[PDB]
Design a protein around this motif. Sequence first.
Motif, PDB file in Angstrom:
ATOM      1  N   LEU A 178      -3.775 -17.243   7.784  1.00  0.00           N
ATOM      2  CA  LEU A 178      -3.622 -17.966   9.045  1.00  0.00           C
ATOM      3  C   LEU A 178      -4.677 -19.042   9.290  1.00  0.00           C
ATOM      4  CD1 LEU A 178      -2.576 -15.310  11.686  1.00  0.00           C
ATOM      5  CD2 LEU A 178      -1.077 -16.821  10.321  1.00  0.00           C
ATOM      6  N   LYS A 179      -5.918 -18.791   8.880  1.00  0.00           N
ATOM      7  CA  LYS A 179      -6.934 -19.828   8.929  1.00  0.00           C
ATOM      8  C   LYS A 179      -6.435 -21.021   8.139  1.00  0.00           C
ATOM      9  CE  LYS A 179      -9.796 -17.065  11.004  1.00  0.00           C
ATOM     10  NZ  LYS A 179     -11.016 -16.656  10.242  1.00  0.00           N
ATOM     11  N   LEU A 180      -6.080 -20.752   6.884  1.00  0.00           N
ATOM     12  CA  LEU A 180      -5.625 -21.759   5.948  1.00  0.00           C
ATOM     13  C   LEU A 180      -4.453 -22.586   6.463  1.00  0.00           C
ATOM     14  CD1 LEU A 180      -5.239 -20.994   2.179  1.00  0.00           C
ATOM     15  CD2 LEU A 180      -3.768 -22.688   3.289  1.00  0.00           C
ATOM     16  N   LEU A 181      -3.525 -21.954   7.187  1.00  0.00           N
ATOM     17  CA  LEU A 181      -2.353 -22.663   7.705  1.00  0.00           C
ATOM     18  C   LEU A 181      -2.697 -23.459   8.957  1.00  0.00           C
ATOM     19  CD1 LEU A 181      -0.110 -22.352   5.697  1.00  0.00           C
ATOM     20  CD2 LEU A 181      -0.381 -19.949   6.336  1.00  0.00           C
ATOM     21  N   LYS A 182      -3.551 -22.892   9.799  1.00  0.00           N
ATOM     22  CA  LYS A 182      -3.992 -23.565  10.998  1.00  0.00           C
ATOM     23  C   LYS A 182      -4.796 -24.818  10.627  1.00  0.00           C
ATOM     24  CE  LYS A 182      -5.774 -22.724  15.491  1.00  0.00           C
ATOM     25  NZ  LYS A 182      -6.966 -23.603  15.527  1.00  0.00           N
ATOM     26  N   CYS A 183      -5.750 -24.653   9.725  1.00  0.00           N
ATOM     27  CA  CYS A 183      -6.542 -25.777   9.255  1.00  0.00           C
ATOM     28  C   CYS A 183      -5.656 -26.902   8.704  1.00  0.00           C
ATOM     29  CB  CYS A 183      -7.548 -25.291   8.205  1.00  0.00           C
ATOM     30  SG  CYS A 183      -8.407 -26.612   7.325  1.00  0.00           S
ATOM     31  N   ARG A 184      -4.547 -26.547   8.058  1.00  0.00           N
ATOM     32  CA  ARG A 184      -3.628 -27.530   7.494  1.00  0.00           C
ATOM     33  C   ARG A 184      -2.724 -28.169   8.537  1.00  0.00           C
ATOM     34  NH1 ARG A 184      -1.785 -26.822   2.376  1.00  0.00           N
ATOM     35  NH2 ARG A 184      -0.322 -25.068   2.639  1.00  0.00           N
ATOM     36  N   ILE A 185      -1.884 -27.355   9.166  1.00  0.00           N
ATOM     37  CA  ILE A 185      -0.860 -27.826  10.090  1.00  0.00           C
ATOM     38  C   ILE A 185      -1.504 -28.428  11.354  1.00  0.00           C
ATOM     39  CG2 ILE A 185       1.202 -27.098  11.503  1.00  0.00           C
ATOM     40  CD1 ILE A 185       1.974 -25.161   9.310  1.00  0.00           C
ATOM     41  N   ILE A 186      -2.551 -27.789  11.857  1.00  0.00           N
ATOM     42  CA  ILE A 186      -3.163 -28.266  13.088  1.00  0.00           C
ATOM     43  C   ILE A 186      -4.354 -29.210  12.881  1.00  0.00           C
ATOM     44  CG2 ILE A 186      -4.434 -27.481  15.136  1.00  0.00           C
ATOM     45  CD1 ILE A 186      -1.910 -25.471  15.257  1.00  0.00           C
ATOM     46  N   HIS A 187      -5.248 -28.842  11.973  1.00  0.00           N
ATOM     47  CA  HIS A 187      -6.482 -29.581  11.761  1.00  0.00           C
ATOM     48  C   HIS A 187      -6.466 -30.541  10.569  1.00  0.00           C
ATOM     49  CE1 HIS A 187      -8.279 -27.070  14.811  1.00  0.00           C
ATOM     50  NE2 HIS A 187      -8.142 -25.972  14.090  1.00  0.00           N
ATOM     51  N   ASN A 188      -7.668 -31.024  10.251  1.00  0.00           N
ATOM     52  CA  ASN A 188      -7.927 -31.916   9.120  1.00  0.00           C
ATOM     53  C   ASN A 188      -6.918 -31.765   7.963  1.00  0.00           C
ATOM     54  OD1 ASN A 188     -10.306 -31.030   6.581  1.00  0.00           O
ATOM     55  ND2 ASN A 188      -9.020 -29.590   7.721  1.00  0.00           N
ATOM     56  N   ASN A 189      -6.047 -32.752   7.890  1.00  0.00           N
ATOM     57  CA  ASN A 189      -4.989 -32.772   6.916  1.00  0.00           C
ATOM     58  C   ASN A 189      -5.193 -33.839   5.838  1.00  0.00           C
ATOM     59  OD1 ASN A 189      -4.193 -35.115   8.593  1.00  0.00           O
ATOM     60  ND2 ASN A 189      -3.178 -33.601   9.926  1.00  0.00           N
ATOM     61  N   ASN A 190      -4.730 -33.513   4.636  1.00  0.00           N
ATOM     62  CA  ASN A 190      -4.554 -34.506   3.598  1.00  0.00           C
ATOM     63  C   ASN A 190      -3.297 -35.291   3.953  1.00  0.00           C
ATOM     64  OD1 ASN A 190      -6.688 -33.563   1.425  1.00  0.00           O
ATOM     65  ND2 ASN A 190      -5.636 -31.720   2.193  1.00  0.00           N
ATOM     66  N   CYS A 191      -3.524 -36.437   4.604  1.00  0.00           N
ATOM     67  CA  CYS A 191      -2.464 -37.290   5.161  1.00  0.00           C
ATOM     68  C   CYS A 191      -1.403 -36.448   5.905  1.00  0.00           C
ATOM     69  CB  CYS A 191      -1.846 -38.163   4.055  1.00  0.00           C
ATOM     70  SG  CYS A 191      -0.953 -39.663   4.579  1.00  0.00           S
TER      71      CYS A 191
END
Length: 191
Positions: A178-191
């Motif tokens: 869930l950390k990993l998904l939140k960081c991706r979908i919500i936070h700092n994204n690779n474009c």
Amino acid sequence: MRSQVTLRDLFDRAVVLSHYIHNLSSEMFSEFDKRYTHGRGFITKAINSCHTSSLATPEDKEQAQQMNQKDFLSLIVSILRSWNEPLYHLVTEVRGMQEAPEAILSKAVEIEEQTKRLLERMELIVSQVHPETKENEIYPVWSGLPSLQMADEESRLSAYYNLLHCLRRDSHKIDNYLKLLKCRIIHNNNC
């Protein structure tokens, strides 16, 4: 359901719950261990037979990161739904006939309800991000009941030891996930 739920909000509390539920499981396990196997010669034995181990899970982080997001989120749901029966039987088993652990029970009851709470959250996450996901229905079976209800003190006590271990393991899995998904979908994204 709803009540003005955004994906940010859903993840905000998914992570609050998953961190809580895990810490509560470490508390539960460490308390059982201490209270229940500290004066005895019971065999530790590491990462034993966990019922969720049959499901394809990343056992890494790059493996988790590389993973199809749609499958990853459904995985999380399958794990969470697989902890229903064992958590029901844990509570019923401590609660029923069984004696003292008013403190372990108190904690089993919370893990049981908070998991179910987390599952609805996760189901909403999924509907919002991947609404094309079809009715899940796949979740790993649990067969620890016989071993929980043994006459032999060492057998029964270890069956509990192992279930609390597995639970502490899996709640840790879900948290990292869930950390990993939140960081991706919500936070700092690779474009």
